[PDB]
Design a protein around this nucleic acid. Structure first.
Ligand SMILES: Nc1ncnc2c1ncn2[C@@H]1O[C@H](COP(=O)(O)OP(=O)(O)OP(=O)(O)O)[C@@H](O)[C@H]1O
Ligand SMILES: [Ca+2]
Ligand SMILES: [Ca+2]
Ligand SMILES: [Ca+2]
Ligand SMILES: [Ca+2]
Ligand SMILES: [Ca+2]
Ligand SMILES: [Ca+2]
Ligand SMILES: [Ca+2]
Length: 903
DNA sequence: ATGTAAGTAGTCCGCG
DNA sequence: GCGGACTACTTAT
């Protein structure tokens, strides 16, 4: 096979590389890498190296990497540019792998692990590691085995061996329900003392040295704890055995009360799954406990046990170990669904970076662009210092707050990357400037044509048309991958709806799910067979289609994020190609595009409807327009439609056959006006929205910018079996809103949009009557908690103390003394509840760590003193007041003259 | 070391 | 009690 790297490090004048060789075996090597950098030279000097602007450079080949670094310093002292890749391991990877890396993940050792540490005096801090590690479960992807290291003897108790037979049993029969599919994959190793457990773990680690190291919170807990515990017991040089090159760096952050640290293990790529999840999942969760995320992602139940975790090992060691094993497996299950490890490997090898650098779009793009430029013997510019400078972004239209019955939305495909490609925006394609007119003059096509020679943006910049920029070139490659995966996601989505439709009439038979590729629209013959399948087979097919959709989602949305990240990186001062002329060239062109096409759409619809001056576009944000379709429907008359799906078909066709071609003509004119390199403004229909035919539903409403709700029947060509709410910005979409309130507000919206005012009033009345009976956690608000110490004056609130921070201080006073009460961690999330006046906590609210039950000693008082009235008022009624006043209807029946009668 | 726009709701304080 | 300046948090793109 082709060789490919696993890990790379720079350690002094040596590059240390782990790799897979041509026989597919893992190897390691130390290389005295001889790097090159470059300096500008006179034109007379013949060379093969040119900077991106075409000025000649001379190559400086160095004896070692230190000499190269020292030269960069002297060039700074002299005042001349030092060109080339200054991150020498990227240069090394580029020289060593001068071809498209084709990697085989079955050769890459991916390790998932988790440890347990019993601690009777609070959270076991990794930096001190003063308590025994009494369990480790370590899954190895090459072996496909869970290696379990179990401490039987400890100062906090001596226990019997864990029983795999009890672990496999149902909970309801006193077992632990360790899933059957991993029982045969467990390798259990008990130990009589911690030293031999740890010694054996290190030897194991030597034999099976992780390349990718992951798990839940491993970076902030498991890794530093293991490292520091081994250091304390055996010494630092033993702890360094966790690095295959025996090198580590200890990063210590101090939070004033008290301290913690991150350990860099040289030669390992740590991808903490919590970090992968936060970057790649596009959720914002109220809690990031593994229980909460597992339930959210997998629909599995919370691993329950009686009593505190500090006493679980002693009271039920059997369950303690099973839960350690299950927790490692849960992460693997989440990754089987989300496929973030696969994404990370794809991206890292594509860019030729350390795999952990996928967290940095700047590093990723620096590497992609460097490699692209190197291939043409071009030399990259030196990174420079720039001061932070705010700059303008997107245009958002102010909507008239209102109900909006029939709506059709359209937006640009990959807007900012498409702008880059159309205009040809790159550091080396800049041709000059032109004198700018006010933006509205371009929007209304009264401004002078910027140029008949160069491709332009209304920020005043001009770019060469007949030569390709590295930014457009490389952004196009990732966009095309993005487009492929999005196609697969949408096919799977459409296939899902076909299955949902068929589930209305399942067949009474025993059959199997069809063997199909869900990434492609089902053939007619598959559709016929589906109509004869049982519920059993259909539900399994639906699950597979949904997993295929999620896999496509992960692949497309994160490639979308990467290319959008390039447009944004042009505005980050740490990006090598930082340039506000290019950053603003993008954002200003986007502003023009949206408002240009708003004008063109209004012009077109007035024309076809035979009217003049009517406002059809009701809203837009960045690259989208929302068109009121009421007049389109009224033109033919509602009476002509047989059912909801008939008018949906009508507008779908209208959008595709009439509006899109008008939109396209509008943008081709704009492209010619700016003399752009290539027309790439493709504004396709997103949503078709309205109430069910014959209902009193209002269809949709806006309260303001970035705040609206729509009843959607078709989304980007997916015709839904059941209408789906598209709600943006409203409290149902905010992780700070209590769970049960999100749910109740969503149902208020559903009723408003689908059923009408009276349905809403009916629901509101019921929820108000029953909400006092809801679980306290389900009605608690949520907030991130930053700068707790700043507002902490003797355990009491300092001036301008935020409400949630006040609650944390109340909690801290209440638990003072308790060494078992969970502490609120700085920057993490807390549940928050208001408290009635005269409560024993001595303040108007309390807050505790999110995703947890509040500690049992104060739980009773919280429940007794919860202010339900304030809670309902603030979290539910107030948002609902905003929705309903915007939509011009009432959530409570108004008093009237009719109240005088007995109905 | 991806970007900016923009929403709600908190504290503080003014207001015969 | 409500609105304006300021702070915190969160979301839409
Ligand atoms: N997270 C982000 N970082 C930087 N820019 C963003 C981000 N989200 C959106 N944008 C900018 O707003 C534009 C429009 O956003 P939108 O969500 O419509 O995505 P898009 O890139 O146009 O892709 P799609 O084809 O899915 O519409 C982007 O092209 C850019
Ligand atoms: Ca645990
Ligand atoms: Ca069960
Ligand atoms: Ca878009
Ligand atoms: Ca059937
Ligand atoms: Ca959009
Ligand atoms: Ca689209
Ligand atoms: Ca109590």
């Amino acid at each position: 096979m082709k060789e490919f790297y696993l890990t790379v490090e720079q350690i002094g004048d040596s590059i240390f590389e782990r790799y897979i060789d041509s026989n597919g075996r893992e190897r390691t090597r130390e290389v005295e890498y001889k790097p090159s950098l470059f300096a500008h030279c006179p034109e007379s000097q013949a060379t093969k190296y040119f900077d991106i602007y075409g000025k000649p450079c001379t190559r400086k080949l160095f004896a070692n990497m230190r000499d190269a670094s020292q030269w960069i310093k002297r060039m700074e002292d002299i005042g001349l540019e030092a060109l080339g890749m200054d991150d020498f391991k990227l240069a090394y990877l580029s020289d060593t792998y001068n071809y498209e890396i084709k990697y085989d993940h079955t050769k890459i050792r991916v390790a998932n692990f988790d440890i347990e540490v019993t601690s009777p005096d609070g959270f076991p801090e990794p930096s001190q590691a003063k308590h025994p590690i009494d369990a480790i479960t370590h899954y190895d992807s090459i072996d496909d085995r869970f290696y379990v290291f179990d401490l039987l003897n400890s100062p906090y108790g001596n226990v019997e061996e864990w029983s795999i037979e009890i672990a496999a049993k149902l909970q309801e029969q006193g077992g632990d329900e360790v899933p059957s599919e991993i029982i045969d994959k467990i390798i259990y190793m008990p130990f009589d003392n911690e030293k031999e457990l740890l010694m054996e773990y290190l030897n194991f680690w030597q034999q099976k040295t992780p390349v990718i190291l992951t798990g839940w919170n491993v970076e902030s807990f498991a890794i530093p704890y293991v490292y520091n515990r081994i250091k304390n017991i055996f010494g630092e040089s033993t702890a360094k055995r966790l690095s295959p090159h025996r090198k580590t760096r200890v990063k210590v952050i101090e939070n004033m009360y008290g301290s913690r640290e991150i350990i860099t293990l040289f030669g390992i790529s740590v991808l903490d799954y919590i970090d992968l999840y936060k970057k790649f999942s596009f959720t914002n969760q109220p809690s990031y406990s593994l229980d909460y995320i597992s339930e959210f992602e997998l629909n599995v139940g919370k691993l329950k046990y009686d009593g505190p975790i500090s006493k679980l090992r002693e009271s039920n060691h059997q369950r303690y170990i099973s839960y350690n094993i299950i927790a490692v497996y849960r992460v693997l299950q989440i990754d089987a669904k989300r496929q973030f490890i696969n994404l990370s490997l794809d991206m890292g090898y594509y860019a030729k970076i350390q795999i952990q650098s996928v967290f940095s779009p700047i590093k990723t793009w620096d590497a992609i662009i460097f490699n692209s430029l190197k291939e043409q013997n071009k030399v990259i510019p030196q990174g420079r210092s720039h001061p932070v400078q705010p700059y303008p972004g997107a245009f958002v239209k102010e909507p008239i707050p209102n109900r909006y019955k029939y709506v059709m939305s359209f937006d640009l495909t990959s807007a900012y990357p498409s702008i880059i490609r159309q205009v040809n925006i790159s550091p080396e394609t800049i041709a000059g400037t032109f004198k700018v007119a006010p933006l509205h003059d371009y929007i209304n096509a009264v401004a002078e044509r910027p140029s008949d020679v160069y491709s332009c943006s209304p920020n005043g910049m001009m770019y060469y048309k007949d030569r390709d920029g590295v930014v457009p070139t490389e952004i196009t490659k990732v966009f095309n991958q993005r487009k492929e995966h999005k196609g697969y996601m949408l096919a799977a989505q459409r296939n899902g709806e076909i299955i949902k439709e068929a589930l209305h009439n399942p067949n009474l038979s025993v059959d199997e799910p069809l063997d199909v590729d869900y990434r492609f629209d089902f053939s007619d013959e598959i559709k016929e067979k589906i109509k004869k399948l049982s519920a059993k087979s259909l539900n399994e097919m639906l699950f597979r289609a949904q997993r295929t959709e999620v896999a496509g989602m992960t692949a497309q949305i994160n490639r979308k994020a990467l290319i959008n990240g390039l447009a944004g990186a042009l505005g980050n001062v740490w990006f090598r190609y930082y340039d506000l002329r290019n950053a603003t060239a993008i954002t200003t062109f986007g502003q023009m595009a949206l408002q240009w096409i708003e004008r063109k759409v209004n012009e077109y619809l007035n024309e076809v409807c035979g009217t003049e001056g009517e406002a059809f576009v009701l809203y837009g944000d960045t690259d989208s327009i929302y068109v009121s379709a009421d007049k389109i429907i009224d033109k033919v008359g509602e009476s002509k439609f047989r059912d909801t799906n008939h008018w949906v078909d009508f507008l779908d066709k209208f959008a595709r056959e009439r509006m899109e071609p008008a939109i396209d003509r509008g943008f081709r004119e704009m492209c010619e006006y700016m003399n752009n390199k290539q027309h790439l403004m493709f504004m396709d229909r997103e949503a078709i929205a309205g109430p069910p035919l014959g209902s009193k539903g209002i269809g949709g409403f806006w309260t303001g910018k970035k705040r609206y709700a729509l009843n959607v029947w078709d989304m980007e060509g997916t015709r839904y079996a059941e209408p789906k709410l598209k709600i943006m910005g409203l409290e149902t979409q905010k992780s700070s809103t209590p769970k049960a309130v999100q749910k109740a507000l969503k149902e208020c919206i559903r009723r408003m949009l689908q059923e009408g005012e009276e349905s809403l009033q009916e629901y509101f009345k019921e929820f108000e009557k029953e909400f006092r009976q809801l679980n306290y956690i389900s009605i608690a608000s949520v907030s991130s908690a930053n700068n707790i110490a700043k507002y902490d004056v003797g355990g009491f609130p300092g001036p301008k103390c935020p409400f949630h921070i006040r609650g944390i201080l109340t909690y801290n006073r209440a638990i003072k003394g308790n060494i078992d009460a969970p502490q609120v961690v700085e920057g993490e999330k807390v549940y928050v509840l208001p408290l009635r006046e005269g409560n024993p906590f001595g303040d108007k609210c309390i807050a505790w760590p999110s995703g947890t039950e509040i500690t049992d000693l104060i739980k009773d008082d919280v429940l007794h003193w919860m202010d339900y009235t304030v809670l309902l008022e603030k979290t539910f009624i107030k948002p609902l007041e905003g929705f309903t006043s915007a939509a011009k209807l009432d959530y409570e029946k108004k008093a009237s003259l009719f109240d005088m009668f007995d109905f």
